[PDB]
Design a protein around this ligand. Structure first.
Ligand SMILES: *[C@@H]1O[C@H](CO)[C@@H](O)[C@H](O)[C@H]1NC(C)=O
Lengths: 99, 50, 49
């Protein structure tokens, strides 16, 4: 519910060094392709960070209904951008219960 | 082994098939029947039907 | 044998590190790509070189 917004501006962005930072499978983008992110360029880049369940990953998409989409974090219907998600069992889970 | 799931090694085998007009050498198992001529039949010559 | 983040680069019409400099598939490619995890055999605690 309290996801962080980071404003990214006035720099040179390298999108090929993203794969060395986190072990994600799919660079699932919507308005563009991941292989063309270095030639063209944008005005502003905004990054939203939150930790959700594995069943709720499919709700981070335009035109979706559920729990996170309609009550926690909503993506627009004309959303251009890209979604990155990966497993975090080794860091965000405890045997006693992560609360 | 302590790395994440996106940094695991993956064994990749890529099969590329030559779809050309050369005579056929390698393909799947189908039993060949006798050839009859001057009859309206369904044929199967090296993969394509009609 | 490649890493897990670059399995998606083994496809026609891709741009990256394996596709541009190591192993490129043609634009009119036909056939199949098979990939499976090999953590049991191709991983060592000291570091594979
Ligand atoms: C993130 O920061 C921590 C501490 O500064 C560091 O140990 C870790 O390597 C960093 N992550 C990456 C992918 O470099």
């Amino acid at each position: 519910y309290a996801w962080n917004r980071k404003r990214i501006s006035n720099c040179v962005a390298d999108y090929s060094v993203i794969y060395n930072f986190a072990p994600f499978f799919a660079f699932k983008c919507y308005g563009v392709s991941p292989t063309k992110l270095n030639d063209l360029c944008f005005t502003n880049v905004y990054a939203d960070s939150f930790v959700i369940r594995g069943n709720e990953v499919s709700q981070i998409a335009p035109g979706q209904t559920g729990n996170i989409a309609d009550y926690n974090y909503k993506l627009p219907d004309d959303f251009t951008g890209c979604v990155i998600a990966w497993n975090s069992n080794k860091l965000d889970s405890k045997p006693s219960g992560n609360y | 082994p302590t790395y994440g799931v996106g940094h695991q090694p993956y064994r990749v085998v890529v099969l590329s098939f030559e779809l050309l007009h050369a005579p056929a050498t390698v393909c799947g198992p189908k039993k060949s029947t006798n050839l009859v001529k001057n009859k309206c039949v369904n044929f199967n010559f090296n993969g394509l039907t009609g």
